[PDB]
Structures are given as C-alpha cells and as structure tokens.
Design a protein around this ligand. Structure first.
Ligand SMILES: COC(=O)[C@H]1[C@@H](OC(=O)c2ccccc2)C[C@@H]2CC[C@H]1N2C
Lengths: 216, 219
C-alpha cells in the first residue's frame, strides 16, 4: 500500500561523528490525533530488529538518548548522535497508519575507522576430507578495513579461478573491521597433481599483495 | 521476563504448510496487543504478515492471499502461524512480535526462526579441522579453523571450546551450491596456548539433530 523509501548513506561515519538517516512516505503518516505513526528499528548484524523510536520521535524504553527522531508528515529523520562502533547495522522505518504496516528497505550504517591490512592464513585440506576424495584449501583474510579486497589463488604459480567460493562477514560491532574467507575446492586427485598453493590478498593498505602459501 | 520465542521446523517442502509457534513468556497472551508475524527475506526486505488480537480476531497482508491463518491457544500462552501451499519464495526468517496501538513493540520481537522451503534433503555437515601447514612467526598469534561442509538446510551454530573461546572468532556466512551449504569459522589464539592447550570446534546442526566436535590437532 504505502511505499516507504529510505536514503542510502553514501559514506562511512567515524565513531564520535553524528549522522542523519532519512525515510519518506508516499502518504502522510500524520494522523487525526496529531501523532505521526512512524517507527525506526535497528537490526544489528545477526540479530532481530530492535525498536528505537515510535510515533516519529518517542524513544522506546531503554534506547540510548543518542537516538532521536523528527520529521514532518512525509519526510522523517533519525539522528544518531556520537556514533559508536556498536551502532553498526541496518536502520529501518515502518509506517503504522495503513494496513499492511509496511517497512522501508533499510539504510546500512558503515563505521569509518583507520585502514587495517588483513591477517591472512592459508590451510591445506585435512586428511579427513582427503579420505572422502575431496580437497578444500581455505584462506582467511581477517580484520581488515576498508571492505574492498581482492583474493587471487595460484597453483604452482598459475592463477586459478574455478572452484573458488568467497564469503564476507558483516562489519564487526566492536572493532569495525571486516573479514573474508575464500575456499578453493578440488578433487583429491586434482589436488595431488600440484605442489604449491597460494592465496594472495590485495587491499588498499599495500601496493604489493599479501601472499600466503604452502607446499603439498 | 516478557519475551517472545518462535519455534517450528526449519525446512518445509513446497506445496506443504509451514507452521510456527510463538510462545509468549513472562506475561499473559490475553493482554490486549496485536500479536504479529513478520518475515524477512534473503536480501533483508521485511514483510508484515498479519496479527491476531482478542484471541480470535485476525487480519492479514493481502500479499498472502488466502494462504495464511493465525490462531491462538490461550491455555499455552501461544499464537501460531500457518502458511499454506508454500513455495521457495516463502523462504525467510520469521519473527513474532507484539504491537500496541501506537506502533510500539517494546523489546517484544522474537529471535527469529529460519524456514527454508525446498525439496532438498536434510543433510548433516562434515566438519574438517583447519590446522596450519607448518610453523610460522610464533610468540604471537595463530589462526585455526573449522570447515563445515555439505549440510542442508541452514543454520549451523559454531562454537569454540564449547563457547569458552569467544574472542577472536569469525564464523563466515554459508555459501550454497547444489543444495548444500558450506561455511568456515576461524579462531585466533596466542601461539603459547596451541597446541599445548586444546582447541575444538563444536558444530551443531539442529535440523538433522547432529552436533559434532572436531579437535584441531597440529599437522
Ligand atoms: C489501520 O489501522 C491503523 O493504522 C490504526 C492503528 O492500528 C490499529 O487500530 C490496529 C488494530 C489491530 C491490529 C494492529 C493495529 C494504528 C495507528 C493508531 C490508529 C490508526 N493508526 C494511525
């Protein structure tokens, strides 16, 4: 029914800065009783949504007074004062004037922190996996910032693109870094055809890749 | 105190019904709220599904057509979601919540229950230890891990030393391929503590009633 639109945050916010997050409604949420029925929620990485504000400007019980809401009848703003690492997550608005009570699609808050190079670790396939005929080589690239990162696999000095699956964590609520795992999966027999396996991480913190390798 | 807890199957086959239970704790379900179901899709869009109020009065999102029923069992302090004729598009995390007239939910949103709608077979993970190839810069930190391969459906829970190892852990989102998921978890500990002190990953997959411990032993 009502479509709620949220603005993207173009830029990460350093701890201690304040930031405004906005949402808009296709219809006025100001009701005949003078109250404006707009909720804001925070969904922290991996958790259920937590109500921050209802009735456009009333803080939910227990919510930090760093959060405040304002707006007219169709444009709304959540102000987060003195942002903390733990404020990272997705902020959603919801209207409560017309059924069904639709949600916006969320605004992700990213925290800006000092650049950090990844700690890179490479692991050979386990003997348990090899007995089943499989061979996964795992590389962790942990606790880096900013999120942009490239991993390249090399086998006996040649780039390998197939059989690689990557996964990235959300931003950490404590230290504001990111991590990534890259797994190269081969058969045991393919694995046994080569000797040197290399994971190479390229990140803004150095012009030269961080290279971790082992020999089978 | 006052909280809400969802339960129900994590996997349902297409065309069958999805049933979930919300148990209200601390407080009687006869208090006058809109006892609500919300779901969150992969990609994180939220959808209001419907409510029950006053034990017997309901309203639903027209998006759900005639497929949804919410009911209540006052004697158990529970309300229920039944969503019929499911398809893969009903795969989501389902939440229950308590709404009041002003839109206030308080802290009353459930933890969420993942429901996957799929014809794929429940499969427990194989859990493989990730131990470092040889030695490296010691007197500092060592990273270990666990590869959790080939399970269905989500989720798995990974802990290290039964939860005693909590700092320095990264459990990565799973990746799905050929109806099986794979995920890894890393832990970083002082080189002084391993291998002299044991490190074990504990991997639970409730959907298949399986829990596995894998001790990480040096190569
Ligand atoms: C569609 O009904 C509403 O949105 C109303 C109200 O919602 C309900 O009356 C209601 C009834 C049953 C379940 C959930 C909400 C929320 C606020 C206050 C009045 C009005 N709205 C502006």
């Amino acid at each position: 029914d009502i479509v709620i639109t949220q603005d993207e945050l173009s830029n990460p916010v350093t701890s201690g800065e304040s930031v405004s997050i906005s949402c808009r409604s296709s219809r006025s949420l100001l009701y005949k009783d003078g109250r404006t029925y707009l909720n804001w929620f925070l969904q922290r990485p991996g958790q259920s949504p937590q109500l921050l504000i209802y009735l456009m400007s009333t803080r939910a019980s227990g919510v930090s007074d760093r959060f405040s809401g304002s707006g007219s009848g169709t444009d709304f703003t959540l102000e987060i004062s003195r942002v903390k690492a733990e404020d990272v997550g997705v902020y959603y608005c919801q209207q409560f004037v017309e059924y069904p009570f639709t949600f916006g699609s969320g605004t992700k808050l990213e925290i800006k922190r000092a650049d950090a190079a990844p700690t890179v670790s490479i692991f050979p396939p386990s003997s348990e996996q090899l007995t089943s005929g499989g061979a996964s080589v795992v590389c962790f690239l942990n606790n880096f910032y900013p999120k942009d990162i490239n991993v390249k696999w090399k086998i006996d000095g040649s780039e390998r693109q197939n059989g690689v699956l990557n996964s990235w964590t959300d931003q950490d609520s404590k230290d504001s870094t990111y991590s990534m795992s890259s797994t190269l999966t081969l058969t045991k027999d393919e694995y046994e055809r080569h000797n040197s396996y290399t994971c190479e991480a390229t990140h803004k913190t150095s012009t030269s890749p961080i290279v971790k390798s082992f020999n089978r | 105190e006052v909280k809400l807890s969802e339960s129900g199957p994590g996997l349902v086959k297409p065309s069958q019904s999805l049933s979930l239970t919300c148990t209200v704790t601390g407080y009687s379900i006869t208090t006058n709220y809109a006892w609500t179901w919300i779901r969150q899709f992969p990609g994180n869009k939220l959808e209001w599904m419907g409510y029950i109020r006053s034990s017997v009065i309901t309203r639903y999102n027209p998006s759900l057509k005639s497929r949804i029923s919410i009911t209540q069992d006052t004697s158990k302090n529970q309300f229920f979601l039944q969503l019929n004729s499911v398809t893969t598009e009903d795969t989501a995390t389902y939440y229950c919540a308590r709404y009041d007239y002003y839109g206030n939910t308080g802290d009353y949103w459930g933890q969420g229950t993942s429901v996957t709608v799929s014809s794929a077979k429940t499969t427990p993970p194989s859990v493989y230890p990730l131990a470092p190839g040889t030695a490296a810069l010691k007197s500092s930190m060592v990273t270990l891990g666990c590869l959790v391969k080939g399970y269905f459906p989500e989720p798995v829970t990974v802990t290290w030393n039964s939860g005693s190892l909590s700092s320095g852990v990264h459990t990565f989102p799973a990746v799905l391929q050929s109806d099986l998921y794979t995920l890894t978890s890393s832990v970083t500990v002082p080189s002084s503590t391993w291998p002299s002190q044991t490190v074990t990953c504990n991997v639970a997959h409730p959907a298949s009633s399986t829990k596995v411990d894998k001790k990480i032993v040096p190569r």
